[PDB]
Symmetry: C4
Subunit: 267 residues, 4 copies
Amino acid sequence: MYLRITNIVESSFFTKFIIYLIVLNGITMGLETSKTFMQSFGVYTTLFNQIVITIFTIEIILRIYVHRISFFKDPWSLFDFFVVAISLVPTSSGFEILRVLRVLRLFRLVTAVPQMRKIVSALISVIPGMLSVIALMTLFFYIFAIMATQLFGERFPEWFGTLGESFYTLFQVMTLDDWSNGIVRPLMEVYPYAWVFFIPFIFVVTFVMINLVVAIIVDAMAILNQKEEQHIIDEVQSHEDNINNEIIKLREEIVELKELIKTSLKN
Amino acid sequence: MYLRITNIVESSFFTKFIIYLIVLNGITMGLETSKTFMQSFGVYTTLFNQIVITIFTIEIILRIYVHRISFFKDPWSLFDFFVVAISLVPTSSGFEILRVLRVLRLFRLVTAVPQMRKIVSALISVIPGMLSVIALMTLFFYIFAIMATQLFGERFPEWFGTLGESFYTLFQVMTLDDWSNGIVRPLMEVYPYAWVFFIPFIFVVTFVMINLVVAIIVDAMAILNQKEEQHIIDEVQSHEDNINNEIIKLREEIVELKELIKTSLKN
Amino acid sequence: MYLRITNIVESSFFTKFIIYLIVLNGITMGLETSKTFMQSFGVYTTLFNQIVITIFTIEIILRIYVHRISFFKDPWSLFDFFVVAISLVPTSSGFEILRVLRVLRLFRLVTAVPQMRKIVSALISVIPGMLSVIALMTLFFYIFAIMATQLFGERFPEWFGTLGESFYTLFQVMTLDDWSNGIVRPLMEVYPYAWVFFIPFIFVVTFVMINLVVAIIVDAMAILNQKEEQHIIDEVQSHEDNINNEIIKLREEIVELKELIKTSLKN
Amino acid sequence: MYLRITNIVESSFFTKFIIYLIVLNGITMGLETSKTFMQSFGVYTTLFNQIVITIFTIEIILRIYVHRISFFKDPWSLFDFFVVAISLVPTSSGFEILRVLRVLRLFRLVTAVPQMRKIVSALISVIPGMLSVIALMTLFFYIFAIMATQLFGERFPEWFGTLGESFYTLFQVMTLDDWSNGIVRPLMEVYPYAWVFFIPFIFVVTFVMINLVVAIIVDAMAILNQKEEQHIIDEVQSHEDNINNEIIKLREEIVELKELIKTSLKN
Ligand SMILES: C[C@H](CCC(=O)NCCC[N+](C)(C)CCCS(=O)(=O)[O-])[C@H]1CC[C@H]2[C@@H]3[C@H](O)C[C@@H]4C[C@H](O)CC[C@]4(C)[C@H]3C[C@H](O)[C@]12C
Ligand SMILES: C[C@H](CCC(=O)NCCC[N+](C)(C)CCCS(=O)(=O)[O-])[C@H]1CC[C@H]2[C@@H]3[C@H](O)C[C@@H]4C[C@H](O)CC[C@]4(C)[C@H]3C[C@H](O)[C@]12C
Ligand SMILES: C[C@H](CCC(=O)NCCC[N+](C)(C)CCCS(=O)(=O)[O-])[C@H]1CC[C@H]2[C@@H]3[C@H](O)C[C@@H]4C[C@H](O)CC[C@]4(C)[C@H]3C[C@H](O)[C@]12C
Ligand SMILES: C[C@H](CCC(=O)NCCC[N+](C)(C)CCCS(=O)(=O)[O-])[C@H]1CC[C@H]2[C@@H]3[C@H](O)C[C@@H]4C[C@H](O)CC[C@]4(C)[C@H]3C[C@H](O)[C@]12C
Ligand SMILES: C[C@H](CCC(=O)NCCC[N+](C)(C)CCCS(=O)(=O)[O-])[C@H]1CC[C@H]2[C@@H]3[C@H](O)C[C@@H]4C[C@H](O)CC[C@]4(C)[C@H]3C[C@H](O)[C@]12C
Ligand SMILES: C[C@H](CCC(=O)NCCC[N+](C)(C)CCCS(=O)(=O)[O-])[C@H]1CC[C@H]2[C@@H]3[C@H](O)C[C@@H]4C[C@H](O)CC[C@]4(C)[C@H]3C[C@H](O)[C@]12C
Ligand SMILES: [Ca+2]
Ligand SMILES: [Ca+2]
Ligand SMILES: [Ca+2]
């Protein structure tokens, strides 16, 4: 069975077929957005849906047989797995968010197209080196969220009532979103020094952001420089090695000229 | 006989005449916004617009005569054509929006001045490399527009009731424009976890934008370095040949002292 | 006589004195904003002002004596002149504006501290290359402001009633300042397709800005690379001269014996 | 007593222990944000807070006997010192700002974890270089703050009534926060030319921000290219001397080919 399966799964027809289904299913999901469309064609697309997820379920199964344990070490396959699994949770449930979580299957367009994987992968590649700064930042947010909650939560429960609330508001302030007329001018009417809290906050988060970006650019180009430097330097020291080695064969060719005469009379 | 007219079209005087017209018609169109001006002088100015529109139409004709098919595969000319043709439809119609489009004709200043031409050209040229990421992003908006229509379009039809609406709203949020007090805080009064939707959306969308720019700057530098790697490397292996050929003149000079120095040593 | 003055004006005491007067003047001008401070013992300050204005006028005359015609080819000195100038015109009634323009004379601390002068200078030096992109963007605003007045000014005269008002509003939008809930959502309630105007506008205007920053950085690095690839090439061709010169005479240690041993055959 | 104490504070056990106490205290401090929690667990965590403060204090004392004079010239230990000191001030007072400042001691996670220090340290090194730009900007605000107060203060005391208030409003305008519908448009209802003040303000503060960033980037790369140039020119430095040492050595062995020619002269 294996090779018979393996050769259908690995084919140029298979993945092409899936992509095509994904794109159709994606057009189909936009149409289900229009209740007008749904009362006039909804039955056609409610099962187009149901059989596409059938095909994807089958595809997922075959691919597991064809790849066995190496399937679940694949980030992309793992995603396909979970994003399909989700659509298998019953279309009528107590948790009804999962029905909307079904739309994530359109991200298989990313999974199955290598230009897209390329993009995404490039994007992800910058993150591991940011985690420490992510960390420093989250710790910064958390300390200030605690302070803001103790300082402002009593009189301003909506914005600062709760740590989670102060977290939310501090993010808002970070995005510079209606932070003065909308948040701290109102705070200052009760707490005139509130600006000594939020303006340093704004300096720090903005400083950290910019410099992260700056640091990325500059450190990338410092590696590009090093890699270029060695090339130039290898070429300089294989080419100036010859001019050194060629003159030595002349410094030598004259000392052997010299001896030829050093054994002239002698005898 | 192309050539009789062809020398007129290619002349310094034809182009400068048109640029002079554009800048004049452009001054004209401004004053046409003043309602008081259109009393005291509206008739003079409608005249000028009709004159200019004629002149422009002729110049396009000549230019098609001179350039023939090469005219309709030149984007600059295509734009001049589509912007002049538009400007020729009757000022009173069913869709009178075209009356407003004829101000686009002022962009011929860009089109006719090579300095400007080159700016616009430089700007356009980052786009083809980007088309993939623009596609990722559009797909991203689209998936999120659908989810957002479903999650919030019932209670918030103005912001999310229709897919286009969710799109519009999602763009506003990307620009960070009044996104918390104006959209998300309202949403959370009905849907307390709505921050689980918009804050990741903001993270992804900002992250992509920043990394696109970063990736442009770093990779531009990379090729700036590749070619200066090759200029330097080509010169150290050129200079070596300059030392080399005036060292092959110390080769013959001692292989000729090689042939004849034991000859000088006779008995 | 000229030198006796010149040696005063050029001394580290003249400049220290003026800088000192500038900081004091700048401290009192802040104090003058307080009406408390102003009524009780604020007549002291009004005369201090007139003492400083004369001293600066003296400073300027002397400086014109010392530097003569080259004074007025100095942008820093010109700035100094005109800034002290407007502070000389009397507190003419109904010219209330010039009273506050006087404050512009604290920009002399910039004019007079070499460190300040250098940042400012560096900042100015970015501009001459940009004047094309500036022109392009200005024209772009003009075309859009004309279209906007025409499309939106009868129904939204505060925002768009006038070319001027339209420029102002398009600038607000460019800064993404309350652009959607505050301008475009209201517009769309009369004109549902208004998003076809502002969203493209926002794309172009933001695209042009990012790329202007991008192209500055990158083209700077190109120039930075052009310089370092020159120094390398010049230090490579550097000793190539005196190496090829010292071994064409090392070819002449052998070239002589064309006659030193061949004439020995002629005994 | 020393080494024994020294073997304690230098141990991997010591640091790990107090890092765990930081993280633990960090969690309990989040919990103290809850009124529910504080009610039925408060005395449990108010003690833990007292416990931790003592331990950090003995820790600070020990680290001092081990490091002594060096300790007080260590910025991280100075920080450590001072946020522990703050927590050592008694809560009972009129000034209860200090009870909130206690949670600053959680920044000790920054001082205690080397990848943290490294990032904070990287961030800081940016600052001394840009202090001159900061002085320029602060000056610019001050001058404009003064003009603002005198121009708009009487009619708009909330935003401009006072030097300090204008500073605040001008900072809001610089972050582009609700600057037009929120501040400048209202102002233009009384003062139609107010845009002649705020749009230049926006242009300058934006320009300077962007350019500062562009400057850090371009100048960091200028420096990288200098190190790179030297290292490369250093290579051309070593190698174009050892080919002139092989020349002198070629001459020193060719100055044997005029006195060993002295073996001719026989016939
Ligand atoms: C810890 C740093 C950020 C901290 C910071 O803010 N650093 C100061 C920067 C330079 N300054 C301009 C201040 C110059 C000062 C003097 S200098 O002589 O440089 O001019 C981290 C955060 C994310 C990291 C990078 C990314 O993961 C991606 C990338 C992966 C590659 O594996 C190699 C590098 C690279 C570029 C990473 C570099 C660096 O690991 C980064 C910037
Ligand atoms: C517009 C410019 C400049 C000069 C020019 O070509 N002006 C045409 C006038 C018509 N004439 C009758 C005078 C010549 C007819 C025959 S002739 O083929 O010898 O042109 C002409 C120069 C040579 C032309 C291209 C190339 O050829 C190659 C290429 C052929 C393809 O098809 C399509 C495109 C393409 C890129 C051409 C485009 C363009 O059109 C070009 C750029
Ligand atoms: C798809 C990529 C962008 C995706 C991305 O995010 N890419 C790299 C990550 C960079 N990081 C520093 C994060 C990785 C760390 C390791 S690294 O070794 O970078 O230090 C695309 C987007 C736009 C593209 C360019 C532009 O059209 C312009 C330009 C045209 C020229 O014809 C030559 C290339 C160039 C520079 C294009 C290169 C590249 O086609 C780009 C960046
Ligand atoms: C060239 C541009 C305008 C034209 C343009 O819009 N250029 C876009 C390049 C797009 N990309 C970078 C993607 C190309 C990558 C493909 S490529 O194959 O390059 O990798 C102009 C506008 C502003 C100018 C600079 C500034 O005055 C400052 C500065 C002054 C100095 O006097 C010298 C340089 C410098 C850096 C100026 C250089 C440049 O004159 C600039 C960038
Ligand atoms: C550490 C160095 C020198 C190295 C050393 O070793 N110093 C003595 C400790 C010796 N041991 C640890 C070997 C003994 C424990 C024996 S055991 O059987 O317990 O392991 C010496 C140099 C300077 C000395 C101190 C100062 O003058 C003054 C100072 C006053 C204080 O108010 C009390 C003591 C104190 C701290 C002094 C302690 C110690 O003198 C110091 C730190
Ligand atoms: C005062 C200057 C800012 C001046 C400015 O605003 N702009 C320069 C013009 C850039 N342009 C491209 C326009 C030049 C055009 C021609 S050019 O072709 O020469 O590029 C200051 C502000 C911040 C300073 C740096 C940082 O502390 C970090 C860093 C520390 C390191 O210890 C060494 C360098 C470095 C990069 C510092 C360099 C520089 O001391 C900076 C940029
Ligand atoms: Ca905003
Ligand atoms: Ca380089
Ligand atoms: Ca707003």
